[model samples]
Target: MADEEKLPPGWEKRMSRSSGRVYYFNHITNASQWERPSGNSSSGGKNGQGEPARVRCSHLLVKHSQSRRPSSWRQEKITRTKEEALELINGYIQKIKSGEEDFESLASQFSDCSSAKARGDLGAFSRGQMQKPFEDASFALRTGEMSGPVFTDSGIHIILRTE
Candidate 1:
């Protein structure tokens, strides 16, 4: 490859030492620019503004299942319908916005996933690891911000950005 070769969007090229070959590297979504399937952190010439890359965050989930295994055991359910699920999840978003409740506390109390034990904390993840809707919303959030209810195959979720 020529030394003046220009890279495409979301990509950077580097020359290998041993083989003396030019290799192209792809970018993963983070804080700088949100790519769906996208920061302030500087990267290429275009992506030099917005948030930094690799934003870390936490969230709370509320699961409502109607037909599934062990359905008999779940006698007390918080959400019975999609509308109900939206109501419950958005309520938490409001609480977080109003400073009435925190993400960890609500997750510990209402989230159904095993990660809820840590207060609905999913830790850090990059693009392509999660479902499309979830991944899109999560990547779009900024540090210290929370997203509205996002629906997916799992259920309704309220995500918080804490990077």
Candidate 2:
């Protein structure tokens, strides 16, 4: 973190998360880069496998945002095609990648989150929180550079890289 980046513009270091807001910290590499089922993000030439690694940051977040659950008991019976799902997911990706869609719009339509109101704020995590493919695709993104139609056992995903 100290070596790779300077502090961000309009950003300052806060020792705690008692205050609410977005905070940017230094990035950490050379830490634990995890091995996945797809076998990406792993390094080698050693005797033993390495543990999962995360980007370097100074403080942990203590967030109290809304919890997501489906709002309607009526239920959504969207019998989406793989192609349709792919279409929906890919369109979302295209918008994000093109800087046309931010978190709010995409989540309102695409995210299955219960609290889509928070605009798909899933929570803070390091490596290994989600699937390997997801983590792989996610970490591969630059801030505001999203990619997608990423499928997992859970479903097809349209990732928005909110660095």
Candidate 3:
């Protein structure tokens, strides 16, 4: 779980105005449904047709330089030992597979990526939209598969493919 709970808009400390009732809200439906409140629903709301499937992914990164800021998605030639990063990524894979943890939760806790605010989620992207190495690794992943560390100039990453 995230160390700091982030409430959605209109949800922060809201009680009297809220039903104390929570459901996954979808903009398309202008309403909500069952699932984690912070999560997107499989159903597309009243339309019955959910949002079109798109490739989505998240990552946890370990960088050689703390000076590098991932917000820009750029990094210097500085590199870390691949073996060291591998151990960390492998540990996370085990935790997720054993149901001892979850990708989003883990990313929120450990990712160096700027998107960690949304649990490290990079959201949907099309082919060629991302860096070649990152895009290739992501698209090759099967649903629910967690990748071993993949390197981009930015950092070493452990990727999770989510539809």
What lDDT score belongs to each candidate, Candidate 1 first?
A: 0.50, 0.39, 0.51
Global CA lDDT of candidate 2, please? 0.39
User: Stretches of candidate 2 above 4 Å error?
Assistant: 1-75
* Cand. 1 TM to true fold: 0.55
Poorest stretch of ten by lDDT in candidate 2: 57-66
Query: Per-residue lDDT of 28-122 in model 2, one digit per residue for the tens?
Result: 43232222212332221222323424321111111111112223223444433444545545545556557564455545544444324444435
Candidate 1 Cα errors over 4 Å, as ranges = 1-52, 66-79, 126-128
Model 2, C-alpha of 49: deviation from truth (Å): 24
Tell me the deviation in Å of residue 153 in model 2: 1.3
Specify the poorest-scoring 10-residue window by lDDT in model 3. 43-52
**Tens-digit lDDT string for candidate 3 (1-163):** 1223233333222123566554544455576554433333332122221332334555566544432642323443445454555665676777684556666766555555565555654554433346767765655644567666676766567667555
In angstroms, give how far residue 48 of model 2 lies from its true place: 30
Q: What is candidate 2's CA lDDT for residue 147? A: 47
- Every model's TM-score: 0.55, 0.49, 0.53
